[PDB]
């Protein structure tokens, strides 16, 4: 049994606007790179499934050769191998088609996991596009997954609560965050050992892109000129705050 998790390395997703700059409509190269946050939730879920089921866990990525060092974090968390297709497209159809080609080279795959959305493109498109190309059911915003007879019992986070679903057969699930899939922190020695675990590299395939043009990308300033209330004396500080809220007709 084989679970695939789609993981994408991205520029540091905690850099504030104050410190954030673009080169050529993308993040300046100086920022620390890392697996995206929902991607790590998906890896964690995959490792939990591996632990419960005895499954193989294969991490598949489309991106830069030098992001292998970051993808190896997934190996240290418990994944068995990384498959990286080398390429630089942001286009969801190009990405998905290349992920599909990599997946088609892994024999039988029983389930595919992905993050709810990537930590740089903010879009939640690639997993659904890939599900379409694979002709498999897509389930967005899953937070838990259990193997059962015939398929998978899946809890999904909705806008008002949750849905309990049963998927028959294979599928593509995108994963949202809950306490139960906060990613584990691998030991220093596990990281070192993961340097030896398998990484397979594949060349990018020829495939079509979307007929959309990206006109511009900009970074809005974030500066409210906050009124800081002296708080050496907290009773005075809240007295001042309530007066100011009154004066400004907020409270």
């Amino acid at each position: 049994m084989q679970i695939v998790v789609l993981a994408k390395v991205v520029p540091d997703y905690e850099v504030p606007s104050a410190d954030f700059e673009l080169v050529g409509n993308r993040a300046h190269p100086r920022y620390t790179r890392m697996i995206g946050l929902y991607d790590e939730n998906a890896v964690e879920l995959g490792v939990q499934l591996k632990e419960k089921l005895g499954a193989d866990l294969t991490v598949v990525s489309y991106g830069r050769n030098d992001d292998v060092q970051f993808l190896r974090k997934a190996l240290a968390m418990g994944a068995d191998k990384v498959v990286l297709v080398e390429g630089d497209s942001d286009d969801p159809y190009v990405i998905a088609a290349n992920l599909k080609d990599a997946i088609d080279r892994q024999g039988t795959v029983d389930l595919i996991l992905a993050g709810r959305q990537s930590s740089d493109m903010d879009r939640g498109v690639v997993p659904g596009v890939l599900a379409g190309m694979l002709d498999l059911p897509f389930v967005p915003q899953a937070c838990s997954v259990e193997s059962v007879d015939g398929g998978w019992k899946i809890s999904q986070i909705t806008e008002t609560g949750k849905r309990l679903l049963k998927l028959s057969g294979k599928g593509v699930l995108s994963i949202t965050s809950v306490p139960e899939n906060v990613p584990r922190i691998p030991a220093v020695k596990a990281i070192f050992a993961a340097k030896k675990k398998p990484v397979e590299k594949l060349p990018e395939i020829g495939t079509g892109k979307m007929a959309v043009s990206e006109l511009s990308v900009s970074i809005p300033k974030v500066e409210s000129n906050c009124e800081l209330i002296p708080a050496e004396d907290m009773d005075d500080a809240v007295r001042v705050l309530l007066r100011r809220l009154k004066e400004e007709r907020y409270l």
Binding site: E14, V15, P16, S17, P92, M121, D122, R123, G124, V125, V126, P127, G128, V129, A131, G132, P137, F138, V139, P140, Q141, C143, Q156, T158, E159, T160, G161, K162, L165, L167, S168, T176, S177, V178, P179, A211, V212, E214, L215, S216, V217, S218, I219, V222, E223, S224, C226, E227, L228, I229, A231, M234, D235, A237, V238, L241, R244, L245, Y250, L251
Partner: protein, 292 residues
Amino acid sequence: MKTLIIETANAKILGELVTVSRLFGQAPDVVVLGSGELQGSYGKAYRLSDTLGANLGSSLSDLIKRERYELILLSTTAIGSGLAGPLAVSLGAPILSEVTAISPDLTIERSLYGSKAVARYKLESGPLVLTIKRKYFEAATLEGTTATEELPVGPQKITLLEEIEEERTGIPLEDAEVVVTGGRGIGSGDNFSILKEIAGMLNGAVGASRGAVDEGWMPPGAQIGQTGKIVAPTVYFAVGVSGASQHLAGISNAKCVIAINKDNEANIFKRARFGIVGDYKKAVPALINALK
């Protein structure tokens, strides 16, 4: 251009999609997913009994092809997102998701880099699938009703076993005029008690950052931000919240953001109107006392 809205019967969400449709043409059609009267007056309306995209088979896509729809509008909701990607692929359509603005000349805007950046796009060749971010477009008033033609659903791949609403307390987050949000800085689930207290006193609601939700201190539906709820209260207390951009994305229209944070360098102070640099365990009890 020939436009199809695909959504549940929910008037708030349908209304947002109608607003968007009006930028592109005068007479959208609608496919309703699931039950409920369809409000508004449309040229043609359809209904599918199932809300899960995986269960629709190819009838819907084949319809869209036959009828030569040029624009397909869905919401950025679990139901919209379950359908949008796969449907675009079946149409060979480009897709742009989480759309936050559309200019009069049809330049389409969306966020990048954790809502730090705004990207602008032009369609070169459609059909086009869009998913529209909730609470970014005004909801059109929907007047009258429209009967629906039943469409066939496909093989059942996913069964809906149970739908479970998050237990509700007090006024909804997205309706509240005062929101009190706790983050990682609160330190425990019990420590949220004083935030619940002050929220109750102000006829407000309690929110959370992803940090507090990941710790289990608040339920997932309390999360505010890019991938949670969007709120525009008069007053927003951000307590023990660093102010990551993805959090800030949920409060762009909050009128008065009040930061209470022990770290004077925290990013939240670049969004806040008022700020208290200090321990919330001192600030909030003091505020409660002053209010009493």
